[PDB]
Amino acid sequence: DIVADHVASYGVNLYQSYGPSGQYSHEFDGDEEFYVDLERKETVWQLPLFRRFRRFDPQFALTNIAVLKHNLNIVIKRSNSTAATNEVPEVTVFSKSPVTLGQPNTLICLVDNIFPPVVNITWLSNGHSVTEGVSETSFLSKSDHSFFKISYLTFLPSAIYDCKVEHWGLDEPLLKHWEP
Amino acid sequence: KTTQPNSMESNEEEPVHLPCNHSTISGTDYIHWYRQLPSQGPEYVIHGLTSNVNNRMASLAIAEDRKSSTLILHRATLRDAAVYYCILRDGRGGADGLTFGKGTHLIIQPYIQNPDPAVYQLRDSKSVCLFTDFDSQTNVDSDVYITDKCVLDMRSMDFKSNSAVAWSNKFACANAF
Amino acid sequence: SGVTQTPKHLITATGQRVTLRCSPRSGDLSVYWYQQSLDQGLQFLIQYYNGEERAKGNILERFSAQQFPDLHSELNLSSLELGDSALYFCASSVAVSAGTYEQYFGPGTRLTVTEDLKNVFPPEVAVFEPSEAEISHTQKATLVCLATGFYPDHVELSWWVNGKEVHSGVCTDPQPLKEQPALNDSRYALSSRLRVSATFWQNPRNHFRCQVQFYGLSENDEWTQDRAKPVTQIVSAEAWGRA
Amino acid sequence: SPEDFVYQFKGMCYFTNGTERVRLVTRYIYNREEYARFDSDVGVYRAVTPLGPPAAEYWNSQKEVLERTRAELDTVCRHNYQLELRTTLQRRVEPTVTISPSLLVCSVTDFYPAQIKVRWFETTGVVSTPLIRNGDWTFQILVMLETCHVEHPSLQNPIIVEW
Amino acid sequence: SGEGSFQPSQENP
Ligand SMILES: *[C@@H]1O[C@H](CO)[C@@H](O)[C@H](O)[C@H]1NC(C)=O
Ligand SMILES: *[C@@H]1O[C@H](CO)[C@@H](O)[C@H](O)[C@H]1NC(C)=O
C-alpha cells in the first residue's frame, strides 16, 4: 500500500461462488469510472465526460473474471474450504443538497462495510416501496477489502423516508430513517 | 496491420535482420514473432514491448518510436529457412491479434562462390532433364513441366547445390528456358 | 510441441461433416483453433479457456467446437465445401492470454475436400540415373526422383541409401505441381534430387531408393471403382550404381 | 444464511507529483485476506500470508509472467494516467456554500476534487464532519460552529459568505 | 486510444 497523490484501481475484479456472480470496475481516487455489465457485455461509464472520451473493451473484463473463477477453485482447496464471514454493515442516509420544500433533491443511502458483496437496498416513501427514481453505484472497494455501496433516490421534499437494507450479517432487516 | 517484405534471402552462417512495420502500434501492444517451417506447424520465436529483448532463440530490436521492429538471428542455417510472421498483440490478449497474416519467406541457401550452370539429361532405371549448379539470383509451354528452384533438406550437411527439373512426355532438352 | 492432434491427414467428399481432435500440452489450459489456407494465410478461428469458449474469429456457422472437462478439444466442420480444403492447426497456451505468453502448436490436420472420392489416385514413382556428362564435368552425380499423377498432394518424399535414410545432397520441390492446372481436381507431380559423389555412384554395389509415402483412404471407406483402392501406402522407386 | 466463497483481484496504481513517481501493486485476495501481491517497487511476486507461497513461488518461476506484470507499469499505470489527465484531472466543480443555524452550519455541497479549505472569519471554536463522499464525483462537508470563507482549487477568487 | 487494465495471473493446478 501507499499514501500517494492519486490512488487508482484499474481492475477491481470480483467473483463469488454464490450466484455465481462477479464485478469488474475501474476506480480513481475512490470513485467509480465504469463497471462492465458481464451479461450485457457492455462497458458502462459513470460520467458524461467519460462517455464522450474514454473507451474500454468489455472483453478484457470477461477474460479477467474467467481467471478469477479458476483462481477461486484452487484457493478454496488450499484454504481447506474456508467460507467468507458475513460483516455487519453500517448505514447512513443524507441529502445531496440542503432540503427546501418543493425543490427536487436526492437522498443518498451509504451502505458501508459490506461483506460478502451481496446486498438488498430498497427505498421507502412512508411504508410503501419506491420502484421508480432509484439508482445505485456498484460495490466500491475499501482498503480493508470490504465494500461500500451508495443508493440514490430523487424526491420532492414534503410534509417520511426509509432506506431498507437486507444483508446476511443482519438478524432482521435494517431500516434507517430520514425526515425533513 | 503489420507490413513485412514478401521474400528474403540470406546465406548460411550469416546474421539475418528481418524487418517489420507497424506505425499504429498502441501503448498496450506487444510485438510477436513466429516462424513456420514448410511442413511443420508454427512456433514462437520472441516477443517484446520496448527497447531490446533476447531469448535463447533470437534477438528483437524495436525502434525508438515503436513504429518498426527487427527480428535478428545471429547465425542462420537451413533449419532457419521458414516463414516469419510479425504480429501486434495486446498484452492482455483477445481475438483481434491472434490471427497470423502473410509473413515473410526467409530463404537460406549456401554461398556458392563460383556457379557452374549446366543442363543434363537422365535415363530411366523415358527421360528427365536437370538444371543444376546455378547461382541463387536466377529465377526458374503446353505439355512441358518445369519445377521451380528446389528447397534443400534442412538436415542436409553436404552437396548443397540447388537445382531445377524440366520434363515432358512429348522434347528438345536444350530448349527449356 | 507437446500438442497432439488427430487425424493427421484427411480426405472427404463435399457436403460431408468431419471432426478434428486435439489434446493440448499437459500443463496448459487454453486451446486455439486455426485454419491455414493458401489464400488466407494462418487464420484464427476459436479459442477455449478452461472448458468454456473464450474468443471467436471468422468461424462460419457451418463450424462448431468445444473443450471438454479433461481439456481436449474437438472441431467439427459441417457441409464441407471445395474451398474448405485447408491445413487446420490446434494450439495450446498455459494461460487465458497469448498477448505475453507463447502458443504451442500441434502437427495440424491436412484436409482436402474433393468433388468425388473417385478423384483419389496413388502416385507413380520413377528414379532417373545421373548423366555421363555431370560426372565428367562436376565429378558429382545427381539422381532425380519423379512422383506423378496423385491426388491429393498428401505425400511425403524420402531418400534411402542402403536401408538408412539420407538428408545430405537432398533437394526437393517446395510444393507438388498441378499436372492439369485448369482443373480444380487436377492430379499432382513432385520431383526431388539426390546429389552424391561420382565415386559413390560408380560403386555398383550401391543401392538407392526414392520412397514416396502417400496418404489415402482408410479400411472404413466405401470404394466402388474398377481400379484398386487408393489407400494410405508407400509407393517407391529404386536404382543401383554403374561404372 | 447461504454459503459463499469470495475472490478479489485489485490492480492498483499509485501516482505522485504527476508521474515523477509511479508505482503499481496488484492484490490477490481470498475473501478478505490478501495472500499474494506484486509491488513494482520490489519487482517480484511475494506471498502476503501462508496462503500465498504456492502462488508466488509459481509466478516468479515464469519469466513471461514476471516481465508482463512488471510491464503493467507502462501498459496500465502510465498508459491510463494520460487518459486521466485529459478527463478526471481537469474536472473542476464549483462548490455551493450556504449558512443555516441548528451552532450555525456552513455546509459546502457538490465539488471536485477533494482538496478543500473551510475556515470561519478568524477565530476557531469549530466542529467539522469528515469529508463526505456522494459516490458520484462530488463531495460534501458541513463545518459547524458554536463570515464563512471557503477555499477550493477550482475557484479563482475564494468564496466568502457572511452571516 | 483505449484504456489499459491489469490482468490477474493464473493460479497453478
Ligand atoms: C489444511 O488441512 C491440513 C491437513 O489436515 C493441515 O495440515 C493444513 O495446515 C490445513 N491448511 C490450512 C490453510 O488450514
Ligand atoms: C433480497 O430479497 C429477496 C426476496 O425477499 C431475498 O430472497 C434475498 O435473500 C434478499 N437478499 C439479502 C442479501 O438478504
Side-chain angles (χ1 to χ4, degrees), chain A residues 4-41 43-50 53-54 56-68 70-98 100 102 104-124 126-127 129 131 133-155 157 159 161-171 173-175 178 180, chain B residues 2-8 10-38 40-50 52-55 57-95 97-101 103-108 110-111 113-120 122 124-125 127-136 143 145-148 150-154 156-169 172-174 176, chain C residues 2-7 9-16 18-20 22-37 40-51 53-55 57-60 62-73 75-77 79-115 119-131 133 135 137-138 140-163 165-174 176-179 181-183 185-201 203-204 206-217 221 223-224 227-241 243, chain D residues 1-16 18-19 22-62 64-85 87-91 93 95-99 101 105-114 116 118-120 124-126 128-143 145 148 150-155 158 161 163, chain E:
Chain A
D5 262 304
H6 297 277
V7 178
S9 275
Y10 297 131
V12 170
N13 300 249
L14 165 60
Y15 177 87
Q16 57 200 352
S17 63
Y18 180 86
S21 61
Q23 187 179 282
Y24 194 91
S25 88
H26 282 194
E27 300 169 353
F28 193 89
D29 287 11
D31 286 324
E32 185 193 20
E33 291 190 335
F34 73 84
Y35 73 96
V36 177
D37 189 312
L38 297 182
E39 285 186 55
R40 278 185 185 275
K41 295 170 182 169
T43 300
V44 192
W45 294 92
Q46 297 283 36
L47 282 184
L49 178 73
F50 298 149
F53 302 101
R54 298 180 85 169
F56 174 77
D57 192 336
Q59 288 305 328
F60 299 122
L62 302 160
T63 287
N64 276 30
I65 297 299
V67 186
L68 296 206
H70 166 86
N71 276 28
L72 184 57
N73 273 26
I74 291 161
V75 196
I76 279 159
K77 288 155 195 168
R78 202 190 298 148
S79 88
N80 297 343
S81 279
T82 297
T85 311
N86 303 317
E87 292 308 315
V88 181
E90 76 164 3
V91 171
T92 319
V93 192
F94 55 95
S95 64
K96 187 158 165 65
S97 60
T100 307
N105 205 292
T106 308
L107 280 183
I108 298 161
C109 193
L110 171 81
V111 189
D112 195 32
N113 196 239
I114 309 162
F115 203 84
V118 189
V119 76
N120 292 352
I121 308 155
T122 151
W123 285 100
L124 293 168
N126 306 116
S129 312
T131 42
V134 176
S135 57
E136 61 161 342
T137 63
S138 297
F139 292 106
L140 283 144
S141 52
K142 290 161 79 74
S143 46
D144 74 358
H145 304 308
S146 64
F147 300 88
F148 73 99
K149 209 176 215 284
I150 294 155
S151 188
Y152 308 84
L153 174 63
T154 48
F155 78 102
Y161 291 93
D162 288 289
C163 180
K164 174 182 159 186
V165 182
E166 294 141 281
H167 193 262
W168 298 327
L170 310 158
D171 281 7
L174 169 70
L175 320 146
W178 190 98
Chain B
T2 59
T3 67
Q4 298 166 265
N6 200 327
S7 178
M8 190 155 285
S10 267
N11 296 336
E12 286 190 287
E13 306 274 353
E14 292 192 301
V16 184
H17 296 70
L18 297 155
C20 180
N21 287 341
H22 36 68
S23 326
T24 54
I25 197 161
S26 95
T28 331
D29 284 339
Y30 274 71
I31 301 164
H32 293 247
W33 286 85
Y34 275 68
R35 68 183 212 168
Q36 191 182 7
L37 296 177
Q40 295 175 21
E43 53 174 50
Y44 169 82
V45 188
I46 206 161
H47 80 286
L49 182 77
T50 49
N52 295 343
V53 195
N54 336 67
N55 44 31
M57 302 198 215
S59 287
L60 167 62
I62 307 149
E64 285 309 293
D65 67 340
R66 300 185 76 221
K67 294 189 181 200
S68 72
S69 55
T70 318
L71 187 69
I72 313 153
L73 314 165
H74 320 125
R75 194 178 161 259
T77 61
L78 303 188
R79 299 191 199 194
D80 293 309
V83 192
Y84 288 78
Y85 309 100
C86 172
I87 307 300
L88 294 196
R89 292 185 169 171
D90 194 293
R92 292 169 283 178
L98 284 161
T99 169
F100 297 89
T104 301
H105 281 82
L106 172 64
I107 312 150
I108 304 300
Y111 167 72
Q113 193 189 352
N114 288 105
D116 198 348
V119 189
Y120 304 110
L122 295 85
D124 176 84
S125 59
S127 75
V128 84
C129 298
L130 171 73
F131 181 53
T132 192
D133 305 332
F134 61 100
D135 80 309
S136 61
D143 295 306
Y145 309 97
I146 325 150
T147 78
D148 208 340
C150 115
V151 296
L152 308 90
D153 193 309
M154 53 181 150
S156 173
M157 288 180 182
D158 218 320
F159 300 98
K160 293 184 189 168
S161 46
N162 285 287
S163 53
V165 164
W167 82 87
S168 186
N169 20 30
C173 188
Chain C
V3 185
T4 81
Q5 207 180 322
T6 48
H9 299 85
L10 216 169
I11 315 154
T12 27
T14 44
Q16 303 282 304
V18 291
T19 82
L20 320 179
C22 163
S23 280
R25 295 203 312 156
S26 67
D28 294 24
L29 267 70
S30 277
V31 304
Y32 310 78
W33 282 105
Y34 280 81
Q35 181 206 45
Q36 195 164 59
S37 46
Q40 284 186 244
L42 189 52
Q43 199 71 49
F44 169 75
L45 294 167
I46 190 161
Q47 183 207 351
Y48 289 80
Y49 176 73
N50 207 43
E53 189 198 277
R54 186 42 41 212
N58 329 76
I59 29 163
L60 310 169
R62 317 189 286 104
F63 287 42
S64 306
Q66 66 175 323
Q67 183 179 46
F68 303 95
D70 63 0
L71 286 175
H72 91 266
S73 183
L75 170 63
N76 339 285
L77 329 160
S79 293
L80 279 168
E81 298 178 37
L82 289 191
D84 294 325
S85 293
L87 208 48
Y88 289 78
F89 285 102
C90 181
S92 178
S93 166
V94 196
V96 66
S97 164
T100 45
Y101 302 79
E102 51 166 319
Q103 279 171 307
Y104 306 83
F105 280 83
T109 288
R110 206 162 212 94
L111 175 74
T112 305
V113 186
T114 177
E115 284 140 51
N119 311 340
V120 182
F121 287 91
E124 309 214 304
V125 193
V127 171
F128 294 74
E129 296 176 33
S131 71
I135 300 170
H137 194 91
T138 66
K140 292 168 188 185
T142 313
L143 304 92
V144 179
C145 196
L146 192 47
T148 48
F150 59 90
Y151 183 91
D153 50 341
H154 297 195
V155 75
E156 293 183 317
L157 202 155
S158 55
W159 279 97
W160 296 79
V161 187
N162 312 335
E165 195 189 342
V166 291
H167 294 283
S168 283
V170 175
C171 138
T172 308
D173 309 349
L177 199 69
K178 267 206 170 196
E179 289 197 333
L183 306 162
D185 52 297
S186 177
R187 297 214 223 160
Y188 296 103
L190 175 69
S191 65
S192 183
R193 314 95 178 88
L194 176 59
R195 169 165 266 201
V196 299
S197 70
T199 56
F200 195 85
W201 167 259
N203 186 331
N206 263 349
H207 185 211
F208 303 86
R209 189 180 65 99
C210 170
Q211 170 178 313
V212 176
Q213 169 68 267
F214 172 78
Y215 293 93
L217 305 165
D221 258 307
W223 182 256
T224 48
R227 71 176 192 279
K229 196 179 179 179
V231 294
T232 306
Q233 62 195 252
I234 298 165
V235 184
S236 197
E238 59 188 20
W240 295 73
Chain D
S1 88
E3 201 201 39
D4 194 11
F5 302 86
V6 176
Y7 201 97
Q8 293 181 60
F9 175 64
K10 289 178 175 187
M12 301 166 76
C13 295
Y14 292 82
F15 302 99
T16 298
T19 43
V22 202
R23 175 182 161 183
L24 85 84
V25 175
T26 63
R27 314 185 181 276
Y28 305 70
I29 305 139
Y30 181 73
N31 297 321
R32 288 181 55 200
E33 179 177 331
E34 193 190 341
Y35 67 87
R37 78 162 55 97
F38 182 85
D39 191 333
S40 71
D41 271 7
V42 172
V44 293
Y45 277 88
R46 275 187 180 187
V48 183
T49 68
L51 194 73
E57 279 192 63
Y58 166 78
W59 287 329
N60 294 315
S61 75
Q62 295 159 302
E64 325 87 42
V65 175
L66 263 171
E67 309 284 9
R68 85 155 311 272
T69 329
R70 293 202 190 107
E72 291 193 320
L73 194 46
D74 292 312
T75 69
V76 194
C77 295
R78 266 157 206 164
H79 179 76
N80 281 20
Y81 193 75
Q82 312 303 316
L83 310 158
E84 301 287 10
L85 213 69
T87 58
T88 330
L89 300 171
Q90 287 175 161
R91 184 186 157 85
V93 177
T96 316
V97 194
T98 55
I99 310 167
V105 78
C106 180
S107 59
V108 188
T109 46
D110 296 13
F111 58 85
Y112 198 84
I116 195 149
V118 184
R119 50 190 165 277
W120 279 99
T124 42
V126 298
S128 178
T129 51
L131 201 144
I132 308 160
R133 152 135 49 199
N134 292 325
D136 66 347
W137 308 89
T138 53
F139 300 120
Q140 273 195 76
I141 186 173
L142 293 86
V143 185
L145 170 85
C148 201
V150 177
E151 272 208 332
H152 185 268
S154 63
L155 310 166
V161 179
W163 168 77
Chain E
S1 174
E3 299 265 307
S5 86
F6 293 102
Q7 194 187 79
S9 313
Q10 263 202 175
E11 275 274 18
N12 173 37

